[PDB]
């Protein structure tokens, strides 16, 4: 895909769940730099 004309990205902003933060979409790979690689496990709650 391509950005909407006159835009460089899309912001997907949840409007129903008021605690959910945004997502974002870009359409050129040069518009991001993968700065940190994070290796992790999810933790089982107590």
């Amino acid at each position: 895909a391509h950005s909407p004309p006159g835009h460089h990205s899309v912001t997907g902003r949840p409007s129903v769940n008021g605690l959910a933060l945004a997502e974002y979409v870009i359409y050129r790979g040069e518009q991001a730099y993968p700065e940190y690689l994070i290796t992790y496990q999810i933790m089982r709650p107590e």
């Binding site: 895909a1 460089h8 974002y24 999810i42 933790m43």
Partner: protein
């Protein structure tokens, strides 16, 4: 082209990245179906990704965007989760591989909630979970996310029904 520099846990940079990862976990409406059930992570390793070509390509585009948007790149630090993380760190993001239509169309997706990106590490909707146990909520297998520098420029505001 790419080297990975391991950060020590006593490094302020390790600590600030860990805090962004931990503090942006939320509950998900699938009850943990896709990404598993958790409130926090065990961070095992944080590596700085160093690639001079990819960085110069990034800063070149960032300046073009900034000049198109009243000198404002609108740069953010955002999470990316997918099964393509190991290809991304060597080759850079490539929109030619990002042809899968999600909610905001084809493109390269990032999230403010680390737990949102965690839903995609094993594929769409968590895929079949980890390779070893086929468990979307695996507490054993190691996962990887990218914490990325992203130029948004002028961003189309799409309100979503989520």
């Amino acid at each position: 082209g790419t080297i990975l520099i391991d950060l020590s846990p006593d490094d302020k940079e390790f600590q600030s990245v860990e805090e962004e990862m931990q503090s942006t976990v939320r509950e998900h409406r699938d009850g943990g179906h896709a990404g598993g059930i958790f409130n926090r992570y065990n961070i095992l390793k944080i590596q700085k990704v160093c690639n001079k070509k990819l960085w110069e390509r990034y800063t070149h585009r960032r300046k073009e965007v900034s000049e198109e948007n009243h000198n404002h790149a609108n740069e953010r630090m955002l999470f990316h989760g997918s099964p393509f993380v190991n290809a991304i760190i060597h080759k850079g993001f490539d929109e030619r591989h990002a042809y899968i239509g999600g909610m905001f169309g084809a493109g390269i997706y990032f999230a403010e909630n680390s737990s949102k990106s965690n839903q995609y590490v094993y594929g769409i909707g968590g895929g079949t979970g980890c390779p070893v146990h086929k468990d979307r909520s695996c507490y054993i297998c190691h996962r990887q996310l990218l914490f990325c520098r992203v130029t948004l420029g002028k961003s189309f505001l799409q309100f979503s029904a989520m």
